[PDB]
Amino acid sequence: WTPQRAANRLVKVVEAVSVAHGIDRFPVDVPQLALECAHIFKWPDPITKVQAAAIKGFDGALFAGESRKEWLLLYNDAVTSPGRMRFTQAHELGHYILHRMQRESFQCSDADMLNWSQDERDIEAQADLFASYLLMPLDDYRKQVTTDVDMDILGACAERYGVSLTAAVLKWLQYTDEKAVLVMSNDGFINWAWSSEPAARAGAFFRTNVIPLPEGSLAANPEILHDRHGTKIPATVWFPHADPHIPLREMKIHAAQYDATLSLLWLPRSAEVWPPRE
Ligand SMILES: [Zn+2]
Secondary structure, three states, rough: OOHHHHHHHHHHHHHHHHHHHHHOOOEEEEEEEEHHHHHHHOOOEEEEEEEEEOOOOOOOOEEOOHOOEEEEEEEOOOOOHHHHHHHHHHHHHHHHHHHHHOOEEEEEEHHHHHHOOOOOOOOHHHHHHHHHHOOHHHHHHHHHHOOOHHHHHHHHHHHHOOOOOOHHHHHHHHHHHOOOEEEEEEEEEEEEEEEEEHHHHHHOOOOOEEEEEOOOOOOOOOOOOOEEEEEEEEEHHHOOOOOOOOOEEEEEEEOOOOOOEEEEEEEEEOOOOOOOOO
């Protein structure tokens, strides 16, 4: 099984069960799927318990029982949010479907839940991709982002799918044809960055080292608490090799669910920011 094929099957289950009950599909009820997952995939070793706990040091876990005949899905419910809990549950369900023959257990941190990538050998990234496909099926998500993008629109996605704002933005970056970069920072320093595919192709990405924010950015000003629609500034503030007249829109919002600052940078479709070829 792959993240996309496994999620596709479970999205069909969600659709069918929601219709049968006469209820909304979203947000997805992950515990219900987890308890049915062995039946849905025709396996003998089910998840038999999905349990909230106050967990220190990680956010979710999947533990094989004695003789690997049943599995326990534990998720943190302390100092978190419903959207983080739902994503953690889906992430652990991803390990159950995709990875459980590799290990006796999985214990997964908030960082694991933010590490979305397309590297198929990174099991944390693969569980994140699974969770993104299950919780935010693209057919439906695309209908939520049409004529404009801003933190209000992406916040509405987060509410609709029952995920964090960060997860809703990452989903958009996963598929958009726009050139955009999300930067998560704390106390003036960049901790994570993620680029849309067009941005990455154009050189607009940051490898993460703890690196200060640009001194002229909206992000770096503690006084600016939020800018949900995005102020137009020179692209060179963030991407020094951009041509000097290229603008960028910089959005800013406090990520309550992660207690950090999110900066969403939106570049023109034509922008290229690679350095000169020496
Ligand atoms: Zn994990």
